[PDB]
Design a protein around this nucleic acid. Structure first.
Ligand SMILES: [Mg+2]
Ligand SMILES: [Mg+2]
Ligand SMILES: [Mg+2]
Ligand SMILES: [Mg+2]
Ligand SMILES: [Mg+2]
Ligand SMILES: [Mg+2]
Ligand SMILES: [Mg+2]
Ligand SMILES: [Mg+2]
Ligand SMILES: [Mg+2]
Ligand SMILES: [Mg+2]
Ligand SMILES: [Mg+2]
Ligand SMILES: [Mg+2]
Ligand SMILES: [Mg+2]
Ligand SMILES: [Mg+2]
Ligand SMILES: [Mg+2]
Ligand SMILES: [Mg+2]
Ligand SMILES: [Mg+2]
Ligand SMILES: [Mg+2]
Ligand SMILES: [Mg+2]
Ligand SMILES: [Mg+2]
Ligand SMILES: [Mg+2]
Ligand SMILES: [Mg+2]
Ligand SMILES: [Mg+2]
Ligand SMILES: [Mg+2]
Ligand SMILES: [Mg+2]
Ligand SMILES: [Mg+2]
Ligand SMILES: [Mg+2]
Ligand SMILES: [Mg+2]
Ligand SMILES: [Mg+2]
Ligand SMILES: [Mg+2]
Ligand SMILES: [Mg+2]
Ligand SMILES: [Mg+2]
Ligand SMILES: [Mg+2]
Ligand SMILES: [Mg+2]
Ligand SMILES: [Mg+2]
Ligand SMILES: [Mg+2]
Ligand SMILES: [Mg+2]
Ligand SMILES: [Mg+2]
Ligand SMILES: [Mg+2]
Ligand SMILES: [Mg+2]
Ligand SMILES: [Mg+2]
Ligand SMILES: [Mg+2]
Ligand SMILES: [Mg+2]
Ligand SMILES: [Mg+2]
Ligand SMILES: [Mg+2]
Ligand SMILES: [Mg+2]
Ligand SMILES: [Mg+2]
Ligand SMILES: [Mg+2]
Ligand SMILES: [Mg+2]
Ligand SMILES: [Mg+2]
Ligand SMILES: [Mg+2]
Ligand SMILES: [Zn+2]
Lengths: 104, 159, 75
RNA sequence: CCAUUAAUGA
RNA sequence: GCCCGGAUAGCUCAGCUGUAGAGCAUCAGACUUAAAAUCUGAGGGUCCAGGGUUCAAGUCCCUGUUCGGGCGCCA
RNA sequence: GCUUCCGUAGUGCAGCGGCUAGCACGUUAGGCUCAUAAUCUAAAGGUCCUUGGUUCGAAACCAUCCGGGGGCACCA
RNA sequence: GUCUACGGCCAUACCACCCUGAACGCGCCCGAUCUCGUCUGAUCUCGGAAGCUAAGCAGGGUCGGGCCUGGUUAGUACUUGGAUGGGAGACCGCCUGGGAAUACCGGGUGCUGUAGGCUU
RNA sequence: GUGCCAGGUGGGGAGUUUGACUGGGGCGGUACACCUGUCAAACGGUAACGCAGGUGUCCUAAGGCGAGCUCAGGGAGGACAGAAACCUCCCGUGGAGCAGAAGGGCAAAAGCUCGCUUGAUCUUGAUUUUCAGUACGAAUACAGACCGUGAAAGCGGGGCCUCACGAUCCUUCUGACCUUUUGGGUUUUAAGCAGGAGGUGUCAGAAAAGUUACCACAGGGAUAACUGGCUUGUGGCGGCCAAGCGUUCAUAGCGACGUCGCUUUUUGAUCCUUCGAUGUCGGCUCUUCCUAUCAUUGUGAAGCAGAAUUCACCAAGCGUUGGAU
RNA sequence: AAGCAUCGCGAAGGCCCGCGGCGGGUGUUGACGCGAUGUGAUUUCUGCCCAGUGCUCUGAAUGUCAAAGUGAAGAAAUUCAAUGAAGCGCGGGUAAACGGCGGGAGUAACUAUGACUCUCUUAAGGUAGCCAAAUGCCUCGUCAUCUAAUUAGUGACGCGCAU
RNA sequence: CGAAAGACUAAUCGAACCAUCUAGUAGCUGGUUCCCUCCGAAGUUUCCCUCAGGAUAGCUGGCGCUCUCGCACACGCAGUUUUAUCCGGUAAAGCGAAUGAUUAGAGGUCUUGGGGCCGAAACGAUCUCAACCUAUUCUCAAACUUUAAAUGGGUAAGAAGCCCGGCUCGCUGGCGUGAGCCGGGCGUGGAAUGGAGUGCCUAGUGGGCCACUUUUGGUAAGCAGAACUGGCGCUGCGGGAUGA
RNA sequence: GGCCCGUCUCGCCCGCCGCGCCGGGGAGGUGGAGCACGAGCGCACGUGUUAGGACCCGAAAGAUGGUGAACUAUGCCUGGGC
RNA sequence: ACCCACCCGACCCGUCUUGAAACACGGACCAAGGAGUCUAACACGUGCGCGAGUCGGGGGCUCGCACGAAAGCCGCCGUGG
């Protein structure tokens, strides 16, 4: 699909429609010192083989893409996640498709 | 098994009749509806938002909520073992007035008028309804002529 | 080892054994589902119905006096 | 340093 | 999920900012009396596509598509 | 049975929906040679299996039928 | 009787052809400076009035097509309930109650609301 | 070399798994989560491995307004230009198009082309749909704000409507001058509340390869391999008609194109009895029964001159052999 | 089973046992030895292929690469960066290791086939031999013979499902 | 341990024997002990690695409560009918109506083309078929339909209903609407039959089968699978000779 | 209708030992197993659901610790026989 | 109530099952034993005492225990549920 990098939409902190800077959300590092991560580390340390399941029945072909909407106006700097439906092609600023053109 | 879709088998139900397609007429948009009005439901294929489910097509309930351009109605659905008074929000175009109450209201008005009449007179007038009575025995006359003799027709093969 | 899938054979008999009922119709039905602005403002009307009690009681007393004068003219 | 072959009778 | 590479003429391979070269093949020319062989010429390059430093990039780097290899596994 | 493949001169075949159905092995010339062997090219060469249908136009796309042929059919 | 503007029901209103329109209308029509938009004042918009019922529109007509409503089709097809009815079956007959649709043959061809005109 | 960690290898060895539906089970398919038309018997509901299908996508516009036009097709014309290139007139109820499968819906639209946009934004509830009236997904009116569009009425909080999707726990990101971080104060960190995402396609969601003819156990005729039972497609057998074969001549003997029946001596189809067992094929021996008669007895018809041979009836009394493989 | 042919090992070794130890078997042993394999006397022969799975050789010419250690930031927990062993990747050998040995096109004066040449997946494409075998569905293959009669037997042919 | 058969290892070997954990587990078979009385089923919805089983609704039993009274004086409820009011798209019928199939004549150079015949050719005479038109004619459609039943499905048949007078509103607002509170006046609301409403626990069941009518797949089946209703299961008795 | 707690929206007012990133209050949505002049506690009996051997009898199994080479399998020592 | 005779009826009980007299399974006969128990957590209903309270757990005081390892009592009468 195609989304632009700017979006005049609602902001939670201001309470009005302001232009937000649009980019794509990605996962972060697990940081190794979370509660469930340290619980899994201690439950895995020692004998016993492996204590928690490894999921190996992948059936989806794509992901729900998430836009990271960041406000443009200073002194607010508000960020917000916005999920769109499942698509396997995705781009920003991607070729506005030019209605009234020869397709060859 | 079948499918569990919302419009499964609505080819003739949620469709428009013959030579009555096109623009929905405007008096249908501008009927008025109050609370407690007895209202039947008939789905229309043109207007598609606010459409009721096909298990309410032909059912009749009472109005509990009147919104801006829709009407809430308490209908009766028999869910296999019991009748449930359940509330559905149906848009205006899928909604007519039920005239089953109008004859009752005119009969109540006629009974109130015929009760105010002949009250100071002292006479007792029957106000209830009564079914089809025996046909009040009479004379069947003829002006001299005899009844026409009917005859069973002789058989002949058509094809 | 196949089996029977679906039927509705004895079900209507089972349903009509215990007497399929009309729903419990009560006077003063609930207001769950009514639009919130109209519920809000009927709540304001029921809140401010206590204002004007002396006018209502005085006009009911004058209505009693009017019915007394009417029944005096009738009798 | 590499170089293969020239259809039968007259 | 990370890292390391590749994608070129109809086909197979080299080629680091100052007309992308060779081999197989096609069509011709040349040597020999003639043929096979040998030599030469011509055609054919979406360099997988796009963007960016630069005056010029395929070559330097990212974004989408494949061909791989090595790691690691919590719903 | 099921999945199929092919029906095109006497023969092996080919054919991008718009060709004069390429062309070779046979049959018949003819050029050439001292006469012969091979030729480098021409003539008399087609029941596109059959029927029906769409398209302007069918071997080429679809449906049935008719002939030659390949493979699967497991435990008690 | 009739028209204009806005309509309700949405062909008894539509479609093909012919005839008639006095007055108020409604339009055809005359131009592009202003507002406006096009390749073109053809459409849209603007400024008007020399002609006109030619056209739209209104009314009427067609042994008109269609549409609406009835008879025939026909108590026919079908169908609720019943039988130790028939028949090898297929199906059919009866009791009991309801009850169609073609072809075919008749009638009709818009009513009405609001506001303002014309026939003073 | 020993002691302790870290990395590779590791069926030498250990534990465990090897889905479900299924006209028995494997193979073949998904009828396992969904959607349309039919089945479906004119409310709804309704099954099979019933039929035709479709889905796990796509869209910065194909979402949301406003404006202008009419689409497919046909006729008539016009240089190249013909049946299809482009221009114009007329007819044109939708016979085109609306992303897809199908159904419904739509004509100054819901279609095409333009102009502006991001209601595809944030936050409480209520309701419908499968339903147990529980979720999830989808949808329906509203409520509070902030907006877009238009001159305004209004419309819009995704796709013209019916599908395009996912619990607990864990992780990641975002938000509050938010709470805790256990003696008190600061800071890093961590834990909390809410929203979104990383997925469970066996789709209300284990983390999972085979073989056993060396096998074992608890059961099942809920379920097969034999026989018996219903049916007879198929196998075999017998009629009806009669275009023709027979030198002429349908029927001496045959008989196409069609059609009506019998049998369980063949294979199919079902699973009704049997899995706390009914010994599973042939051959040898032996007895009885049926006639759908090969021969013998008695007959009728021949394309019966005699011989030989075909058709048909009464008829199972008596016979139906020895061997190579 | 003898014969044949491989593999490892020169003793702080090869193969193996052991909960354990300067433990133990081979070993009162030393390559004509010990341990692990395949094939199965004599004769003759043992063809081609290292692409795959194995095994094995070296290599700062190196992609990945844990712990410990090194440097940088901070108040520190912590984070980052370089270095980064063996092994996997890359490169040779190895089939008396496991194993594998098919299709396509052109081409010979009757047809047919292909002595000859090129290419594919993936590395060559079944060599010498042998056979309807204990190995062939078709099949009771075809021919000769053994019989009066042979789905049996023997001898030949090879198109050999699948030597 | 095996000159190799998973052979032998005390009649025991694809992991000996004895004792213990251990009365291991089993959604799987079998059995389950006195009488009488009363009431009395289900093999169905949804979910589950669920298909021999559970959970959940349904069917069932018990315990009750709240009310009415054949003691001169009944509100409500139905596998019922009627009176009005809507819903359908099934049977039937139609395709001289649309979509799809499909038969044959007749009249018209719409309009070309192929085998064709008279002609160098001609829309010049004759007809032919592919696609053409006009009225006709024959047969159809579960996934066609203008129509369109019978059987059905909801509603209303009153006191929780009408008719008045007045307050409140922060909704809407040219005045006005709409909704909610008060006060007052009027009772047999069609046929027949019922005494009704309601709250806890709660076992068993979740393998069904047959028959009139409709109907799917199959040549058909004592075949497989559906819809309404009734039976067997759970039920004896008279008849069908026997017998779900 | 009203009140309590959590969360959201619109706005204003009051108080001080420390005038603050203080504390409290209003109106209207919504969630709670709440309040709204109590009804529980203790014992006993019946039924139902469980954990335990769990109505009774039943496996193929797994683990721990021991006993056997008087049969048989093989190696060694010492005798016998053909 | 013991035996015999006649008429009509009358297949062998339990279980799995849609269906059993079954050519489905267990079953010669008889006597004895033999299978829904006990603890804890709950839920509902019922009986009793007290009542915004209720209960004494545990412990202590009285009798040397025949009856008893009973009963009675507690500024512990409420620490605590
Ligand atoms: Mg460790
Ligand atoms: Mg079942
Ligand atoms: Mg003009
Ligand atoms: Mg005019
Ligand atoms: Mg005129
Ligand atoms: Mg007419
Ligand atoms: Mg193992
Ligand atoms: Mg196991
Ligand atoms: Mg299975
Ligand atoms: Mg129905
Ligand atoms: Mg528009
Ligand atoms: Mg809003
Ligand atoms: Mg749209
Ligand atoms: Mg074996
Ligand atoms: Mg086997
Ligand atoms: Mg059975
Ligand atoms: Mg059998
Ligand atoms: Mg037959
Ligand atoms: Mg003849
Ligand atoms: Mg036996
Ligand atoms: Mg026997
Ligand atoms: Mg006979
Ligand atoms: Mg013999
Ligand atoms: Mg070897
Ligand atoms: Mg070799
Ligand atoms: Mg190798
Ligand atoms: Mg050979
Ligand atoms: Mg022999
Ligand atoms: Mg031989
Ligand atoms: Mg063995
Ligand atoms: Mg009883
Ligand atoms: Mg089970
Ligand atoms: Mg239908
Ligand atoms: Mg019909
Ligand atoms: Mg069961
Ligand atoms: Mg059955
Ligand atoms: Mg026990
Ligand atoms: Mg128990
Ligand atoms: Mg046991
Ligand atoms: Mg185990
Ligand atoms: Mg059972
Ligand atoms: Mg039973
Ligand atoms: Mg049975
Ligand atoms: Mg029995
Ligand atoms: Mg029997
Ligand atoms: Mg049994
Ligand atoms: Mg016995
Ligand atoms: Mg006893
Ligand atoms: Mg309970
Ligand atoms: Mg109690
Ligand atoms: Mg407690
Ligand atoms: Zn902001």
């Amino acid at each position: 699909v195609n989304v632009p990098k700017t979006r005049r939409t609602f902001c939670k902190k201001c309470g009005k429609h302001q232009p937000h800077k649009v980019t794509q959300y990605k996962k972060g590092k697990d940081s190794l010192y979370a509660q469930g991560k340290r619980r899994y580390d201690r439950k895995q340390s020692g004998y016993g083989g492996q204590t928690k399941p490894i999921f190996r029945k992948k059936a989806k072909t794509t992901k729900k893409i998430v836009l990271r909407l960041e406000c443009v106006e200073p002194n607010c700097r508000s960020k917000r996640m916005l999920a769109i439906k499942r698509c396997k092609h995705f781009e920003l600023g991607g070729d506005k498709k030019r209605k009234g053109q020869v397709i060859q | 098994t079948n499918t569990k879709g919302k419009r499964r088998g609505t080819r003739y139900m949620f469709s428009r009749p013959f030579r009555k397609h096109g623009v929905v007429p405007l008096a249908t948009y501008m009927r008025i509806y109050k609370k407690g009005d007895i209202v039947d439901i008939k789905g229309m294929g043109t207007v598609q938002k606010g459409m009721p489910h096909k298990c309410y097509h032909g059912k009749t309930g009472r109005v509990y909520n009147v919104t801006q351009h829709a009407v809430g109605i308490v209908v009766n659905k028999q869910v296999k073992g019991k009748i449930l008074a359940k509330r559905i929000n149906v848009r205006i175009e899928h909604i007519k007035h039920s005239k089953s109450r109008d004859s009752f209201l005119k009969r109540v008005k006629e009974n109130d008028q015929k009760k105010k009449e002949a009250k100071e007179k002292g006479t007792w007038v029957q106000l209830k309804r009564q079914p089809a009575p025996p046909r009040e025995a009479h004379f069947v006359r003829t002006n001299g002529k005899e009844p026409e003799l009917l005859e069973p027709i002789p058989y002949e093969f058509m094809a | 080892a196949k089996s029977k899938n679906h039927t509705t054979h004895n079900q209507s008999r089972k349903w009509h054994r215990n007497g399929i009922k009309k729903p419990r119709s009560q006077r003063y039905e609930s207001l769950k589902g009514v639009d919130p602005k109209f519920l809000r403002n009927m709540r304001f009307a029921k809140k401010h119905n206590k204002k004007g009690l002396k006018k209502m009681q005085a006009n009911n007393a004058k209505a009693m006096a009017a019915r007394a004068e009417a029944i005096k003219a009738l009798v």
